[PDB]
Amino acid sequence: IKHTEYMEFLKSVPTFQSLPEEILSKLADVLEETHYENGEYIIRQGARGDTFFIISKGTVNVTREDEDPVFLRTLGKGDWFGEKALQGEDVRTANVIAAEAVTCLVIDRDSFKHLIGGLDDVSNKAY
Template structure:
């Protein structure tokens, strides 16, 4: 039987390996594990849809996703990048208080995402200044690359 404790330890050590969370104190990380949900996706499923409201942050624990975005001059959203285990997404809508700015589509069967809701995300980020500054800067950089892509 897989106990709650085993689950806790599994995700705790996984989150330890996620570069974004490297500097978080142990008790913070443990709290995140306590309030995590795990969502499962199959290839082709939308995890996030551009333009929709969103209140969740995701960390990929297994599998792969692609990021696509509507682009001027193209009928279909264009692929921007691929994300894999240890990568995360969905921070931008939470930080910019805006709708989702890209699509996230599962590209591998049996993809597992750890899901953190807005309140817990704010608690995770808000009390840790370096993480907050890092993500804010990253989100601004994403906005700039969105503009660049749509200009040329």
């Protein structure tokens, strides 16, 4: 049941909407569904990371020391984050904190580097 749910969800995300269905299937098989509550750190700035996150429920706040924290933006269902530590250096460039009950579909580096990393929408992500 979860497998089909994951594939339908991934398809609905514009970044992933055009992937071959077998690649979507592989992603659905390797991802880990992870749950957070309000105020829980998902990512800390300056940590070293190896995971990519797709939000399937809730919202998160992104902040950065750029010594007090500054608010960058809020991300929500269908948005994703954590790609910068998978591009070149592995350092996290911002904090990501749950703003309510959150579900993320988590993709590790082993799968990301084959199935997602070649996507321009991810590799050339502007901000």
